[PDB]
Design a protein around this ligand. Structure first.
Ligand SMILES: O[C@H]1COC[C@H]1N1CC[C@@H](c2cc3nc(Nc4cnn([C@@H]5CC5(F)F)c4Cl)ncc3cc2Cl)[C@H](F)C1
Length: 262
């Protein structure tokens, strides 16, 4: 297969709508990523959000081409794969790599939130790495505008991935967008430091969630995590979205600013 100047070489993954393919320019040899969407209002909205994005920790958009019923979303290629593939199951990764990926994830989320966009599905699968190991937030098919004209809009739509969603999505009809993204960055932090997800969903039924709320850090995955990053996780993984830590105050946390090496 091929599109105009680009040759479709290898499948990079699949989602709810589409498949991402690696495309090499036949003339200039330049390699990019292309989302190949089949078949209406969500694709018009996704393209709109994509053109607004311009940050070193956010996947860069190039343009789109329509060929009948198939669209082609040309995005920046992250040659390093995903952050998911860097997390060793039950171990995670070295603390200085987790801290560095976390600083870059915060930079991207501060950026998105500043332009009034919420990603709504932050997870290691959506966090891609470039050749120099730089984190990029990818996949804006669930992304939405939470701030327009300096006016905040509360969300009501259920979306994301259950182990990563904040508890207010399950228990509230309307909720703020920014604390939902912060919660998922805390589950990503946990995954990087323990190589394991704490619960299946942050609901009443979940015993693992109930045990976290009781400050039983003597259980997994919390016992795998050191006292400095675990104190940050205690501030991010708070059930009350209004009591939860904000990104400006995460930037002031002790582990966040702790010099780490190797
Ligand atoms: O994993 C699924 C399920 O949950 C999320 C979804 N994912 C979202 C990201 C999406 C994606 C893939 C990309 N992959 C790359 N590069 C990539 C991925 N794997 N690899 C190869 C593993 C390797 F590095 F060799 C490369 Cl290169 N670059 C841009 C991309 C843009 C996007 Cl939008 C990818 F196709 C689909």
């Amino acid at each position: 297969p091929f599109v105009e100047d680009w040759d479709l070489v290898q499948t990079l993954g699949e989602g709810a709508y589409g498949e991402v393919q690696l495309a090499v320019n036949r003339v200039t040899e330049e390699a990019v990523a292309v989302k190949i969407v089949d078949m209406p209002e969500n694709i018009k909205k996704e393209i709109c959000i994509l053109k607004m994005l311009n940050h070193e920790n956010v996947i860069k958009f190039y343009g789109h081409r329509r060929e009948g019923n198939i669209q082609y979303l040309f995005m920046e290629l992250a040659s390093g794969g995903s952050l998911f593939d860097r997390i060793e199951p039950d171990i995670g990764m070295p603390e200085p790599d987790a801290q560095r990926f976390f600083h870059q994830l915060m930079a991207g989320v501060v950026y998105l939130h500043g332009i009034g966009i919420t990603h709504r599905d932050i997870k290691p699968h959506n966090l891609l790495l470039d050749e120099r190991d730089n984190l990029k937030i990818a996949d804006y098919s669930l992304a939405t505008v939470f701030r327009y004209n300096n006016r905040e809009r509360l969300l009501n739509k259920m979306c994301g991935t259950l182990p990563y969603v904040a508890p207010e999505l399950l228990k509230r009809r309307e909720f703020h967008a920014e604390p939902v993204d912060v919660w998922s960055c805390g589950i990503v932090l946990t995954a990087m430091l323990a190589g394991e997800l704490p619960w299946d969903q942050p609901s009443d039924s979940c015993q693992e969630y109930s045990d976290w709320k009781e400050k039983k850090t003597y259980l997994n995955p919390w016992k795998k995590i050191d006292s400095a990053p675990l104190a940050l996780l205690h501030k991010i993984l708070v059930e009350n979205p209004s009591a939860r830590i904000t990104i400006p105050d995460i930037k002031k946390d002790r582990w966040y600013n702790k010099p780490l090496k190797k």
